[PDB]
Amino acid sequence: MHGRLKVEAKRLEREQKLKLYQSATQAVFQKRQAGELDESVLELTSQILGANPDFATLWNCRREVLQHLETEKSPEESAALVKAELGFLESCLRVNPKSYGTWHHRCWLLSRLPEPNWARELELCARFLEADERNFHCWDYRRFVAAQAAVAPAEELAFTDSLITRNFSNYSSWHYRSCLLPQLHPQPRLPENVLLKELELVQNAFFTDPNDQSAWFYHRWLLGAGSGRCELSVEKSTVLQSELESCKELQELEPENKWCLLTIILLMRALDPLLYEKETLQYFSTLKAVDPMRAAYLDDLRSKFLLENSVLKMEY
Amino acid sequence: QKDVTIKSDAPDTLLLEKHADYIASYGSKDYEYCMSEYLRMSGVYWGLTVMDLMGQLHRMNKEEILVFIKSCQHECGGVSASIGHDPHLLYTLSAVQILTLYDSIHVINVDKVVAYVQSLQKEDGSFAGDIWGEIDTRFSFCAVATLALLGKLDAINVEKAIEFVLSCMNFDGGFGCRPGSESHAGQIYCCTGFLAITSQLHQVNSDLLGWWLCERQLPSGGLNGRPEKLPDVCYSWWVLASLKIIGRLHWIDREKLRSFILACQDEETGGFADRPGDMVDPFHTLFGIAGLSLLGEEQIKPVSPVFCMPEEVLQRVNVQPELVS
Ligand SMILES: C/C=C(/C)CC/C=C(\C)CC/C=C(\C)CCC=C(C)C
Numbered sequence: 001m002h003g004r005l006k007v008e009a010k011r012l013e014r015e016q017k018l019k020l021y022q023s024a025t026q027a028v029f030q031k032r033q034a035g036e037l038d039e040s041v042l043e044l045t046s047q048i049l050g051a052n053p054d055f056a057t058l059w060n061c062r063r064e065v066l067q068h069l070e071t072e073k074s075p076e077e078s079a080a081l082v083k084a085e086l087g088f089l090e091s092c093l094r095v096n097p098k099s100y101g102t103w104h105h106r107c108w109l110l111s112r113l114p115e116p117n118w119a120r121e122l123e124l125c126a127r128f129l130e131a132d133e134r135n136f137h138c139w140d141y142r143r144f145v146a147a148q149a150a151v152a153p154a155e156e157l158a159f160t161d162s163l164i165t166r167n168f169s170n171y172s173s174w175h176y177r178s179c180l181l182p183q184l185h186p187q188p189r190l191p192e193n194v195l196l197k198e199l200e201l202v203q204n205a206f207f208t209d210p211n212d213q214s215a216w217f218y219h220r221w222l223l224g225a226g227s228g229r230c231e232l233s234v235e236k237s238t239v240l241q242s243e244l245e246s247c248k249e250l251q252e253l254e255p256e257n258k259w260c261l262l263t264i265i266l267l268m269r270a271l272d273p274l275l276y277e278k279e280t281l282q283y284f285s286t287l288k289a290v291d292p293m294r295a296a297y298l299d300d301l302r303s304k305f306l307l308e309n310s311v312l313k314m315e316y
Numbered sequence: 317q318k319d320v321t322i323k324s325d326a327p328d329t330l331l332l333e334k335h336a337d338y339i340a341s342y343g344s345k346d347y348e349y350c351m352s353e354y355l356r357m358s359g360v361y362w363g364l365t366v367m368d369l370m371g372q373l374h375r376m377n378k379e380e381i382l383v384f385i386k387s388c389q390h391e392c393g394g395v396s397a398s399i400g401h402d403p404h405l406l407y408t409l410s411a412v413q414i415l416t417l418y419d420s421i422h423v424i425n426v427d428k429v430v431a432y433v434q435s436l437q438k439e440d441g442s443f444a445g446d447i448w449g450e451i452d453t454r455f456s457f458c459a460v461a462t463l464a465l466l467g468k469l470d471a472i473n474v475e476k477a478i479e480f481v482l483s484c485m486n487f488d489g490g491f492g493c494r495p496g497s498e499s500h501a502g503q504i505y506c507c508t509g510f511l512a513i514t515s516q517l518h519q520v521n522s523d524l525l526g527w528w529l530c531e532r533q534l535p536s537g538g539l540n541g542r543p544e545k546l547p548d549v550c551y552s553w554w555v556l557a558s559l560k561i562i563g564r565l566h567w568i569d570r571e572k573l574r575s576f577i578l579a580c581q582d583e584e585t586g587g588f589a590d591r592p593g594d595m596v597d598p599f600h601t602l603f604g605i606a607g608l609s610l611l612g613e614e615q616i617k618p619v620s621p622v623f624c625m626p627e628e629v630l631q632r633v634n635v636q637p638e639l640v641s
């Protein structure tokens with residue numbers, strides 16, 4: 001268990017919750033061994049799964065009941081049970097939106113239906129992502145729904161844009177963009193025009209909020225996702241040099257910002273390792289003073305880059 | 317930015333005696349214990365492993381555990397968390413780990429365990445956790461870890477399993493639950509553990525992933541599971557074990573992390589909590605102590621970064637996957 005702060009009637013209330021939970025659990029298992037796959041099981045498990053959605057066996061019992069009732073109920077009665085189940089799932093998700101069991105039961109349920117309302121499931125996603133934009137369960141469910149409904153990469157890309165601009169907490173939405181972009185193109189590395197548009201979007205982000213670590217992580221990826229030094233186009237070379245000078249300006253505004261310093265080093269690598277060897281080494285020293293916890297990593301990176309440089313000088 | 321601030325009266329000493337007493341007495345009654353029965357087998361694994369890392373396994377109830385495990389194996393070969401509950405890969409792994417600690421694998425039907433695991437593999441190489449079909453890289457790791465410990469890795473389609481796991485690798489070097497899922501330290505441990513067992517660590521970008529992992533360390537010294545979240549002592553396992561597997565453990569500030577972990581101990585009750593001042597539990601007690609072993613703490617047995625069990629146990633069963641370093 002996570003997040004339980006340490007600090008009679010509080011002790012008593014849960015003493016009474018337990019005996020109810022225990023008797024309800026007792027009752028469920030008795031019915032199950034008796035082969036009573038009926039509505040009373042759904043009533044009993046609803047009482048338990050509300051507070052304790054990680055009790056996986058009880059989700060399995062709900063599924064066994066639903067399967068069994070479907071064979072011996074009418075189509076209209078079966079439909080009614082399904083809608084009741086969706087209501088129950090939504091109320092469970094309101095209480096605990098980060099349980100594997102609940103999200104999976106919803107997928108199981110939706111995967112059985114002809115015909116599910118996927119537009120509505122996508123809206124449910126957007127609501128939960130408004131509450132917590134990093135809920136990976138919800139992003140996973142959205143990817144499941146999008147595939148089911150065959151929503152196109154372009155639509156999902158448009159969704160990620162609004163999310164990134166309306167506020168921070170963007171790591172999950174940048175991650176989604178990194179999977180969407182290669183699909184839009186794709187290949188058996190991003191095309192330069194795409195790459196240049198993304199760089200513009202990401203540099204907006206980390207100048208708008210320089211503490212936003214997600215934009216810096218995504219930017220490091222973009223830097224490696226191109227056709228390479230040195231088939232640097234005139235436009236890419238100009239863009240990167242421009243990014244270099246904007247990072248130095250930001251370094252002036254935010255002198256304890258480690259991300260800007262690391263990015264300068266990476267840009268110089270992307271531009272011309274040997275021409276910038278002196279400056280690269282100066283930046284490593286500044287960076288280690290600013291981010292001492294990463295000193296071992298930074299020394300190893302610098303060692304890698306120094307080897308690269310020796311290899312470049314020897315190809316003369 | 318999100319981080320805890322450690323108090324200057326936080327424990328700065330390792331309280332093994334208190335932790336062994338805490339675990340030895342755990343489940344002597346009880347709300348949280350009863351509410352968590354759905355994971356009991358894994359709960360038993362956490363307690364026994366941490367006691368064995370501290371040299372105190374003898375204080376637990378061997379004979380009683382062996383009977384409990386046998387009663388949890390279902391006719392299909394899979395093992396459940398507790399009696400009456402349904403079988404699952406998670407608890408199948410935990411049971412096999414326990415039996416491995418006790419050198420009592422004969423207690424269950426091994427041929428049937430193998431058949432169960434084999435049966436949960438899908439056409440794309442993934443594993444479902446049970447018959448209801450939830451797919452997660454967690455379950456890929458559970459399947460190959462179970463099989464490796466039984467000497468039966470050849471029982472599954474390993475190349476397809478590898479392909480599925482590599483399809484879960486992300487732009488940042490990490491892994492998620494399924495293809496397209498965001499990187500998270502827990503999944504990263506499962507997938508790097510999977511790749512160690514199947515001999516595919518050369519397919520990991522160790523420098524990129526290692527950087528992402530060492531950036532989990534916050535100014536407090538503690539580690540988070542992904543960007544912009546709070547530190548949690550169980551990341552001392554998930555993040556460090558991954559780093560160790562990929563040969564980048566030195567990319568962490570060892571002394572700052574060690575101070576964070578020790579500050580998560582309860583000096584009164586023993587055990588570790590997820591963060592200082594929270595309530596302790598057996599789960600965070602294992603992962604805190606295991607995290608310290610990985611950092612070279614002398615009072616604790618060396619721990620396998622892949623299997624989260626004492627290395628001496630794995631030496632005995634001759635299953636020690638090669639790491640990057
Ligand atoms: C979400 C927060 C936490 C702390 C959980 C993170 C860890 C995850 C999802 C990995 C779980 C791993 C397994 C079930 C594999 C078995 C674990 C061991 C053998 C240590």
Ligand SMILES: [Ca+2]
Binds near residue numbers: 373375378
């Ligand atoms: Ca004993």
Ligand SMILES: [Zn+2]
Binds near residue numbers: 002548549550551
């Ligand atoms: Zn934790």
